[PDB]
Design a protein around this ligand. Structure first.
Ligand SMILES: [Mg+2]
Ligand SMILES: [Mg+2]
Ligand SMILES: [Mg+2]
Ligand SMILES: [Mg+2]
Lengths: 113, 92, 96, 112, 75
RNA sequence: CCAUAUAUAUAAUUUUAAUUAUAUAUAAUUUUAUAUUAUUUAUUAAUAUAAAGAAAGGAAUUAAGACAAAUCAUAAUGAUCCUUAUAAUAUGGGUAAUAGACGUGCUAUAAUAAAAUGAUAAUAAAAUUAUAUAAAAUAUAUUUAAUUAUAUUUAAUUAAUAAUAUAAAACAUUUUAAUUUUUAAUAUAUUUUUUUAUUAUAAUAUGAAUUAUAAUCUGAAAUUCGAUUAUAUGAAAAAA
RNA sequence: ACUUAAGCAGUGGAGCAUGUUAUUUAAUUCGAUAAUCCACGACUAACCUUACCAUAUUUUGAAUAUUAUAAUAAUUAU
């Protein structure tokens, strides 16, 4: 577990789900609460269905909220489960995470944060 | 950028402690100080902008700027409004 | 100590005038600490978090081509219907 | 009587119970009336002012409802709503603090 | 309030209707300071359950209405 | 992994605490040599004596059974019950009542012990300060000042910078009821802050409960029911 | 071998504070009860906290969903 090498030890920063430091403690508490609420929302967002009898339950880990000076990055792992010519539901979900032009989730979260 | 920077001076780590009734928890604030010398304001603004753009997760930053220079109310604005209200103006 | 009090009073008055300070040699209660007290309303009010959060019900309007499922809500409805099958459901609320 | 409180107030985004709603309502109305309360208090507490003005200000202070009082606000746990053993550093009761701290939810917090 | 420079703890009261029609003033304001002009007037002060009727004297002035409506049974 | 000891790095040694800070690494679970005792005979162990060492502490880390626990406030699910009320809001009241009984703590019941005083300021650590913190000064209690408590005014600092905050016991002098073991008047002295002679000369100057009066503090509000100060009051508490 | 026993150092008959219990109370919110003992949480109960009492007052209420209406913005062809 060599600490001097970034391939041989887990950064201690990674054993917290919210990774942040604010000089303004009020804002840090607020950001922690925001991360917990968004994690609960994302958990709610991982179940989909293509009409009845077509339930799809994506399983995501806890979110990892990387707060830097000018950006927040919400990283999470997930597990799911001719295809070139349509988008399945999981693809639509992820594309609303980042790629939609009008009401993608990260813009709404940017306003929230 | 051409800036003389002394180095990340270790500053005292702040310890915060909490007792749960006897489980102990603590949080450590690590602090580094980098000082800049003999530089123009504009180059130093470039430094701050660049390092802000490419900052790391979980690190906060405070910047003090020292600029050598040549020598050369909500309550109050409401108290006036209340005193110029009929309820208070009638007693005066 | 030997300095006359008039000299120090003149110094205090002139200094207070320069630095925009209340000069109150009589020591009367002026309520100035009330004026100078900070407003704590915003920090106190933001205690429980930002209320303008995205909620599950908004998802139906933002992303109509995705039909999300709230497992908790579906379970609550299933339990409500299961009770109503046994005759253990809530009575009809009285109305005026 | 659609809303239990006189003034419509948005709900907090997380855990809810009746006591959290009561506390949140009082916090919102304290924010809204803080300047008025401070101005009235200043008028009441300024001995340069006439006694009638001070008495009128004190009367208006006593006439205000309970949901504008700063002393009525109580810090509750944002996760469980409990009002005992709340750590202000996280707005959590001690049990919720321990749970979240062991889950890694609280940034920087470690077992000692 | 308690510090004398702050003045009495005056509260709103239906006193004029009791100063013209001689009716009792029913109040839950147990913290109200009895002012000198309350003298003679009849009060009905809440004790938490009932309204103790009293008539204000000059010996009560300065005291508070709640002092004359005890809230707990003695035994 | 802490801590401890050491090395390197960093700090333009005015954010100074370089006697420091915090990153990285090293170290020990110590080792060697004799002598005496025992020995499963040494290449063992203990004791002692030498030698080299700064080296002497601590924490965490897995399961399996048994019983308890609904402030299980360590949850979830289910069942059951209320639905104009067992849900919800406001005003006031209570949780502070007092015959007892007990647990815990604080202050005491005096001389190996209490008090007062000690300014170029004896000597700390660890924390806290944007939902603050309050310096110095001035004014009143109040008495030359100091001390203590409030008020006035808010300097600096959102902090290795400024403030809370000159740590306190310690130590030194003085004082101290019971105690005629003392004080005082005269003499007296080579003990002079003192000696000697002759004359007079169970609760305190311990304790601080209770209560009265007047102020103050926070708060919109101190009545039930808060805290502080001053002037009075001055209880119980001695033995086993 | 927890425990006991021994030794050392204390504390321990009063006042107060704080809990529990008993009684009281409109309420004194809640906590034990198969015979040694033991109902006993407070990182702060004036209002809030609060759970309790009295009196007033609210009635789809804090949620999600359905169905209507009344507006408000976007789009069709009014
Ligand atoms: Mg409070
Ligand atoms: Mg004494
Ligand atoms: Mg109460
Ligand atoms: Mg109430």
């Amino acid at each position: 577990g060599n600490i001097n090498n970034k391939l041989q030890h887990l950064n201690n920063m990674n054993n917290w789900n919210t990774q942040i430091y604010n000089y303004n403690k009020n804002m840090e508490i607020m950001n922690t609460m925001n991360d917990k609420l968004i994690n609960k929302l994302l958990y709610k967002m991982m179940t989909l269905k293509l009409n009845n009898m077509n339930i799809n339950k994506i399983i995501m880990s806890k979110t990892i909220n990387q707060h830097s000076l000018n950006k927040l990055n919400i990283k999470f792992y997930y597990y799911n489960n001719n295809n070139n010519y349509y988008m399945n539901m999981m693809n639509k979900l992820m594309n609303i995470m980042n790629n939609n032009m009008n009401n993608n989730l990260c813009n709404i979260l940017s306003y929230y944060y | 950028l051409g800036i003389p920077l002394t180095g990340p001076k270790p500053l005292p780590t702040r310890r915060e402690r909490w007792t749960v009734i006897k489980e102990n928890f603590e949080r450590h604030t690590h602090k580094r100080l980098i000082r800049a010398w003999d530089t123009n304001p504009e180059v130093l603004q470039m430094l701050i902008a660049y390092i802000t753009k490419h900052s790391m997760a979980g690190v906060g930053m405070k910047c003090n700027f020292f600029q050598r220079s040549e020598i050369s109310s909500a309550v109050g604005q409401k108290v006036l409004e209340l005193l110029d209200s009929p309820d208070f103006k009638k007693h005066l | 100590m030997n300095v006359p009090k008039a000299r120090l009073l003149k110094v205090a008055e002139l200094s207070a005038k320069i630095f925009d300070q209340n000069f109150n040699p009589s020591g009367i209660r002026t309520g100035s600490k009330i004026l100078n007290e900070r407003l704590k309303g915003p920090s106190v009010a933001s205690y429980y978090g930002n209320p303008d959060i995205l909620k599950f019900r908004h998802l139906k309007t933002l992303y109509p081509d995705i039909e999300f499922v709230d497992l908790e809500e579906q379970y609550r409805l299933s339990m409500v219907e299961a009770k109503k099958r046994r005759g253990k459901g809530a009575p009809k609320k009285m109305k005026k | 009587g659609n809303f239990r409180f006189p003034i419509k107030t948005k709900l907090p985004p997380g855990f809810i119970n009746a006591r959290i709603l009561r506390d949140n309502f009082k916090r919102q109305q304290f924010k809204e009336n803080e300047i008025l309360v401070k101005s009235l208090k200043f008028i009441a507490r300024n001995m340069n002012l006439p006694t009638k003005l001070r008495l009128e200000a004190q009367l208006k202070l006593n006439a205000l409802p309970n949901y504008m009082r700063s002393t009525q606000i109580k810090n509750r746990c944002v996760d469980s709503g409990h009002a005992r053993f709340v750590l202000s550093d996280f707005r959590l009761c001690r049990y919720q603090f321990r749970e979240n701290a062991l889950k890694g939810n609280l940034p920087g917090v470690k077992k000692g | 309030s308690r510090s004398v420079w702050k003045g009495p703890n005056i509260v709103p009261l239906p006193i004029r209707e009791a100063m013209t029609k001689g009716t009792p003033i029913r109040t839950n304001a147990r913290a109200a300071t009895i002012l000198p002009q309350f003298v003679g007037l009849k009060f009905q002060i809440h004790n938490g359950k009932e309204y103790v009727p009293i008539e204000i004297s000059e010996d009560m002035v300065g005291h508070k209405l709640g002092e004359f409506a005890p809230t707990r049974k003695r035994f």
